[PDB]
Amino acid sequence: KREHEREVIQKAIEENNNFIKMAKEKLAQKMESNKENREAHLAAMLERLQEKDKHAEEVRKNKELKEEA
């Protein structure tokens, strides 16, 4: 009976520790994915805007080439 009483108390302690552990890890991994995902959405949008700045400058060089004739 005494081995079993310790068994039970230690199992209660273990289930509470595992509950804390999984919440801790699930939260951590969700913050991580969101950081990556949001930063990538912004990088994509900004990468696109610069690709337009590239085209504008090419539109300026294009104007001078025709400007010498």
């Binding site: 009976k1 068994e7 039970v8 108390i9 302690i13 289930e15």
Partner: protein, 429 residues
């Protein structure tokens, strides 16, 4: 000789306090532990339940346990609350939440050793300790879960002393809490294996007596508990007062328990009469005797007419001729001999004590060991399986570390216990 008394949880401390209140009055002890009695008959056996302190002060050999302070203050601030030894209060703060697992395995685990220390200190102060008595309910968390944990630990340190409990079974007529059949079933399992004698005090029976017989339209625990203290005083008369019986707890077990597992007693008390025009009539021994055996007077909600008595002990108190008592008791047996098994000759015994309970000229106390007590365990078993069939409310207990198997083997043990009673109900010579 000496008995160590333990009360655990709300119910146990409630009825435990009324018990000391009542027997203290009988032995002439006032709330400050001074003796103010006339007869010396009240001090002949006072050491059975009281320790003698310096200055002619008698202090109950009582240990008060609870997992929450509430009832501790309540007892300590009540009538006869100052009489108790202040070291013998052992309480926590968490409470058990009416959860057997908290009382037995998690929260009670921390407090239990403190109780064993007080238990040990009282036992060593005894000339020749005969055993222990515990008051508790089975429906809650502390008295049920931690009370049985205490029994188990105490049995391991005193394996040959007598272990005796006054155990209150739960009833839906009195209580609201859905998990009580769970707590009671786990408790009954511990009681069949680790106690020698258990008085089954059924809240279902106490309620019917107060509501039907006594006509109490708004019964309180004070009403129920005043029935319990009267019965507890009655069943302990032959320990606390001398006369014609050279009997202790072991002798009572030997002659009351013919098979180890069948040690659950059905108690009863007479007189019981509703207010108030009949409260002034004089009681005759024939009337006391008929009332004592009446099924509606039993303090476990089970019909003794449905089964057979293995053994019966009856105790009468007050001024009365033993001849009348003898004749009346023999009348009941000779005229209803089919309700007593014939393979145990002369299996109903009587004791008479001169001192009557307070307020009564006469009284009788009934201790029956009857196969019909199975009805009590069947009732609790039905409530248990209705819930357990679907694992309902199980998470309160598995969250404390318990397994389902522990529930399965508790219900299993109780079902076998039922079977055993049934087999001597049909056993013949």
């Amino acid at each position: 000789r000496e008995i160590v008394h333990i009360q655990a949880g709300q119910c146990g401390n409630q009825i435990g306090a009324k018990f000391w209140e009542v027997i203290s009055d009988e032995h002439g002890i006032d709330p400050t532990g001074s003796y103010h009695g006339d007869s010396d008959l009240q001090l002949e056996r006072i050491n059975v339940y009281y320790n003698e302190a310096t200055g002619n002060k008698y202090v109950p050999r009582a240990i008060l346990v609870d997992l929450e302070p509430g009832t501790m203050d309540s007892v300590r601030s009540g009538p006869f609350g100052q009489i108790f030894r202040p070291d013998n209060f052992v309480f926590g703060q968490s409470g058990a939440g009416n959860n057997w697992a908290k009382g037995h395995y998690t929260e009670g685990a921390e407090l239990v050793d403190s109780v064993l220390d007080v238990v040990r200190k009282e036992s060593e102060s005894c000339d020749c300790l005969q055993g222990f008595q515990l008051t508790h309910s089975l429906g809650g968390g502390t008295g049920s879960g931690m009370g049985t944990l205490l029994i188990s630990k105490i049995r391991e340190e005193y394996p040959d002393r007598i272990m005796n409990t006054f155990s209150v079974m739960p009833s839906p007529k009195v209580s609201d809490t859905v998990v009580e059949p769970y707590n009671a079933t786990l408790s009954v399992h511990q009681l069949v294996e680790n106690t020698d004698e258990t008085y089954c005090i059924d809240n279902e029976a106490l309620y019917d007596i107060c509501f039907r017989t006594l006509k109490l339209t708004t019964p309180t625990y004070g009403d129920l508990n005043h029935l319990v203290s009267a019965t507890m005083s009655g069943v302990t008369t032959c320990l606390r007062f001398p006369g014609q019986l050279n009997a202790d707890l072991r002798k009572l077990a030997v002659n009351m328990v013919p098979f180890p597992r069948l040690h659950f007693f059905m108690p009863g008390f007479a007189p019981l009469t509703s207010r108030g025009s009949q409260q002034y009539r004089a009681l005759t021994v024939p009337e006391l005797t008929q009332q004592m055996f009446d099924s509606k007077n039993m303090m476990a909600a089970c019909d003794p007419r449905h089964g057979r008595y293995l053994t019966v002990a009856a105790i009468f108190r007050g001024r009365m001729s033993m001849k009348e008592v003898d004749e009346q008791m023999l009348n009941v047996q000779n005229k209803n001999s089919s309700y007593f098994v014939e393979w145990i000759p002369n299996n109903v015994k009587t004791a008479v004590c001169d001192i009557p309970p307070r307020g009564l000229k006469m009284s009788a106390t009934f201790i029956g060991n009857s196969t019909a007590i199975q009805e009590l365990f069947k009732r609790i078993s039905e409530q248990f399986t209705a819930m357990f069939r679907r694992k309902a409310f199980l998470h309160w207990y598995t969250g404390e570390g318990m397994d389902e198997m522990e529930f399965t083997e508790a219900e299993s043990n109780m079902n076998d216990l039922v079977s055993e009673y049934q087999q001597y109900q049909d056993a013949t010579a």
